[PDB]
Design a protein around this ligand. Structure first.
Ligand SMILES: Cc1cc2nc3c(=O)[nH]c(=O)nc-3n(C[C@H](O)[C@H](O)[C@H](O)COP(=O)(O)O)c2cc1C
Lengths: 292, 286
């Protein structure tokens, strides 16, 4: 009597929601047995100041769904720049998630993580049914705010204020190799056939994003948008400073190279260990995120 | 029980994008508001969330509307965000916009936009939770305007900074906040705290400088502004920063109220202070 048929492309919609940048939280609580349970959530909002109200959304598909909705108290841990691993641990299917964080129990028995950007001890007010998820509303009972910069998530992956500084230091040291994790759908652009390499060009001076956008657009014949810094490092083998950006390509077949889905990258040979590390990160940050 | 500033500042730790919720009132006139307390709720059915203060002027018009739209602003749309947070007579004069298939104001050059139908309005304290079912949407690859802690951040600035850094020496400045007070050096002619260097991590350098200067603990945040001083000729990298509690060794933390008839070191310094006081008179909650 209701219409069970796809209207929008789940990828297209998920990617559109991704345009709105968010920080990263880890929702924590204790199950019926008193065992700490948790999950990474970026679908969080500050609701009211008087009374102190907060919001977070949990998928009905969650393993912890029953334990969570049944819990009376929960805590929101707003992760800092250095807590990329916590976000991954608490989003990935791991045996003991709480073994990846230094944590303690709050005044109201909720797992509070250390070195976080901010944390909030809550009491559940209401659980609102909303599609494939539920809206959990909590009343802030206790909180703390360290000046600590928070871990961010925009579009594909994480961003941190840290990297801008790291990039500037590298840029002054000498020439930089400007690389990019250029995504089409969920497919990363890679140059070569037998030994795949990320698109890059080594320059000294100018706006790295402007330079890289021009290079990529020329290379692929596609329209490109350079986003947040992905990684800044010194190649241990090469010796060269490396500035890697997260980027997006318009639809179509590129002039040269190809866009590969994580499934195709499984048994692929890479230009360098660094290149492989970045691809490993891309495929892992592809196996995670809100919705399916 | 809780300090509204302390709590507001704690919520601010969680970065967001910047949306402009739009609709048409009973008279059919376009209405809108800047909102950052937005969340993607469900994929099947497509569900979305945005919070509106009960104190809002448009509160009655909004809750009474059946359809609305979400405008996920891009990096270049700081001033759109400002217009729609501030009380101006013609807000819609500040944006190139059109009406969507369901008669909602859709802005051009946005990072993404969502056309919705109201599903429910949930009462939640000094605000209401508006739930919308997506009827249409569009996503340009465009980077979004971001809001973390006291102000805006954009991916743009990282690149802008790197270009400047390679050109030569940079003046590293900071919008260093204590409570709602910005740190300023000098007595008659106030200047933002800064030091000119060539090489190293600008954030590391600035944290060291500020901590030494003030005798306070500092956290350097997102890039605030990158520009070339028109008078000086010097490249300027300005960071958003935070100071621990207490009186600084030198200089002083001034409230927007105290800055009103204050003389500044340069027009640029004044532009940044103007921006600080304006992005102080805006943000979620009153
Ligand atoms: C950045 C990011 C944001 C996420 N946001 C949410 C969210 O808001 N709600 C949700 O249910 N899952 C979210 N997830 C995925 C979950 O953490 C996780 O896979 C699962 O729902 C919790 O594990 P469980 O099934 O064992 O409870 C997110 C993952 C990432 C990386």
């Amino acid at each position: 009597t209701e219409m069970t048929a796809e209207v929008f492309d789940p990828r297209a919609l998920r990617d559109a929601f991704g345009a709105f940048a968010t920080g990263v939280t880890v929702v924590t609580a204790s199950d019926a047995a008193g065992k700490p349970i948790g999950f990474t959530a970026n679908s969080f909002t500050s609701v009211s100041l008087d009374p102190p109200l907060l919001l977070v959304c949990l998928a009905k598909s969650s393993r912890n769904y029953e334990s969570m909705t049944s819990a009376g108290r929960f805590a929101i841990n707003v992760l800092s720049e250095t807590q990329k691993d916590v976000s991954n641990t608490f989003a990935r299917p791991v045996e003991d998630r709480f073994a990846a964080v230094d944590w303690r129990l709050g005044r109201d028995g909720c797992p509070i993580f250390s070195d976080v950007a901010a944390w909030f001890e809550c009491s559940m007010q209401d659980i609102i049914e909303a599609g494939d998820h539920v809206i959990i509303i909590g009343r802030v009972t206790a909180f703390e705010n360290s000046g600590l910069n928070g871990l961010g998530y925009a579009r594909g992956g994480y961003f941190t204020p840290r990297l801008a500084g790291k990039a500037v230091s590298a840029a002054v040291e000498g020439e930089i190799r400007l690389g990019a994790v250029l995504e089409q759908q969920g497919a990363v652009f890679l140059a070569g056939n037998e030994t795949l390499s990320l698109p890059n060009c080594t320059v000294e001076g100018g706006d790295p994003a402007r330079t890289l956008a021009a290079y990529l657009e020329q290379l692929t014949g596609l329209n490109v948008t350079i986003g947040f810094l992905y990684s800044v490092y010194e190649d241990k083998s090469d010796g060269r400073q490396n500035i890697v950006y997260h980027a997006l390509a318009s639809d179509g077949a590129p002039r040269q190279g190809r866009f590969l889905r994580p499934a195709e990258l499984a048994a692929a040979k890479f230009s360098s260990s660094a290149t492989a590390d970045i691809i490993n990160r891309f495929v892992l940050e592809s196996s995670i995120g809100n919705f399916g």
